[PDB]
Each structure stands twice: as structure tokens, then as C-alpha cells.
Amino acid sequence: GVQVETISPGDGRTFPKRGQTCVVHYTGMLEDGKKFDSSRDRNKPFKFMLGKQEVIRGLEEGVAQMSVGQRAKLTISPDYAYGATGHPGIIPPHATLVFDVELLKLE
Numbered sequence: 001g002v003q004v005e006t007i008s009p010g011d012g013r014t015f016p017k018r019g020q021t022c023v024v025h026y027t028g029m030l031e032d033g034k035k036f037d038s039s040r041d042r043n044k045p046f047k048f049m050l051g052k053q054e055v056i057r058g059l060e061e062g063v064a065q066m067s068v069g070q071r072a073k074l075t076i077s078p079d080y081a082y083g084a085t086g087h088p089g090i091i092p093p094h095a096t097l098v099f100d101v102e103l104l105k106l107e
């Protein structure tokens with residue numbers, strides 16, 4: 001569902017717990033294609049709480065297996081992303097997504 005390839009290693013010990021707020025930088029693109037979003041270019045980290053279905057399953061499960069400081073390439077299959085419906089106007093049906101995610105801190 002989500003494949004994780006490490007860009008930079010974390011501490012290897014500090015992982016997100018259920019109900020914790022994850023602070024991340026991300027860049028998102030369609031596989032081998034167009035970039036659709038970046039928190040890095042606007043210099044504003046993205047915050048979400050784990051275990052609250054706030055983000056796509058691929059990102060949730062990608063961040064959940066990352067330690068603090070880790071940066072990774074997340075390849076997210078459509079079923080762990082926006083599926084056959086897509087995201088209106090931005091993400092097509094059956095789109096595999098690539099997120100470059102850095103887990104900055106947990107709060």
C-alpha cells in the first residue's frame with residue numbers, strides 16, 4: 001500500500017504514538033510527473049494527529065513507521081491514496097502518489 005525508501009535516517013528509536021501530533025515537511029507529486037503541493041516552498045510545516053483518519057492511509061502509515069528526523073520517499077498506491085474517485089481537480093482516478101516526507105518533531 002505504501003512503500004518507504006529512506007532519504008535521510010532518523011534516530012531509529014523515536015516513533016509516533018497513537019494520538020500524537022506529527023509535524024512534517026512534505027512535497028507531493030504524481031508518480032513520474034507533476035508536483036501538486038509542497039510545505040517546504042511555503043516554509044510552513046504540516047501538522048496532523050495520528051489515529052484520527054486526518055490524512056490519506058499511505059501518509060498516515062508512512063509517517064507511523066518513521067523515527068524523528070527521518071526523511072523518506074513514500075510511494076503510495078491508489079487504494080492507500082484517493083482511489084478510483086481521485087481528488088477533485090488535482091488528483092486523477094487511480095493515481096500512484098509520491099511524497100517526500102520529513103518527520104520534524106512529535107508533539
Ligand SMILES: CO[C@H]1C[C@@H]2CC[C@@H](C)[C@@](O)(O2)C(=O)C(=O)N2CCCC[C@H]2C(=O)O[C@H]([C@H](C)C[C@@H]2CC[C@@H](O)[C@H](OC)C2)CC(=O)[C@H](C)/C=C(\C)[C@@H](O)[C@@H](OC)C(=O)[C@H](C)C[C@H](C)/C=C/C=C/C=C/1C
Nearest residue numbers: 026028036037038046048053054055056057059087090091
Ligand atoms: C489547502 O491545502 C489543503 C490540503 C491539500 C488538499 C489537496 C491535496 C492534493 C494536498 O495538496 O493537500 C496534498 O498534498 C495531499 O494530498 N495531502 C496533504 C498532506 C497530507 C496528505 C494528503 C492528505 O491526506 O490531504 C487531506 C485530503 C485531501 C482529505 C482527507 C484524506 C483522508 C480522509 O480520511 C479524510 O476524510 C475525512 C479527508 C487533506 C488534509 O490533510 C486536511 C488537513 C484534513 C482534512 C480535510 C480532514 O482530515 C478533516 O476531517 C474532517 C479534518 O480533520 C480537518 C483537519 C478539518 C479542517 C476544518 C480542514 C482543514 C483542511 C485543510 C486543507 C489543506 C491544508
